[PDB]
Amino acid sequence: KVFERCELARTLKRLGMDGYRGISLALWMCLAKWESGYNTRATNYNAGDRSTDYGIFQINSRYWCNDGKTPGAVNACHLSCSALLQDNIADAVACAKRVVRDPQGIRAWVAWRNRCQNRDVRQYVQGCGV
Structure with missing residues (x-):
């Protein structure tokens, strides 16, 4: 799913992202825009180290989620990397x-x-009601 700006802002606020560990919503919004242009199915293969960045926040498979094909990877958010390609971002957010x-x-x-x-x-x- 490719989110609209303000639509994403309230969606993140609802999931408890506003001020999570001192991080404001605007900063999280900035991250998603630059990481994936608000696209939950965004993907990036990194041939140099053979890992992949998945979803709206572009979370790397070598450390946070398991895709099974990344060499010497770990799974810190204990999630299938597939969970990061869902239209619903609750799992991306937990990670x-x-x-x-x-x-x-x-x-x-x-x-x-x-x-x-x-x-x-x-x-x-600005203008999102958050």
Whole structure:
């Protein structure tokens, strides 16, 4: 499913993402936009290390979810990577939260550092009723 901006904002707020571990909604919105353009079926194969980024938050298979074909991978959110390609994002969200519980937090995503860190992200949730 490819989400509309404000539609995604309320969906994330409902799932308890607003301020989760100090992370505001705008930042989470910024992450999803840049990670997948709000597309839950977004996929990215990384031939260099043979892992895959799945879904709306582009969660890597080598550490967070199991797809069975990634060499020497782990499954930290204890989920099939397939759960991250669902139109319903409750499972992606449970995993996105697991990720930020680690020390780096939301910085675990390098693209977040590139396009969201120390940026004006108000625009992402302006007009969304959140």
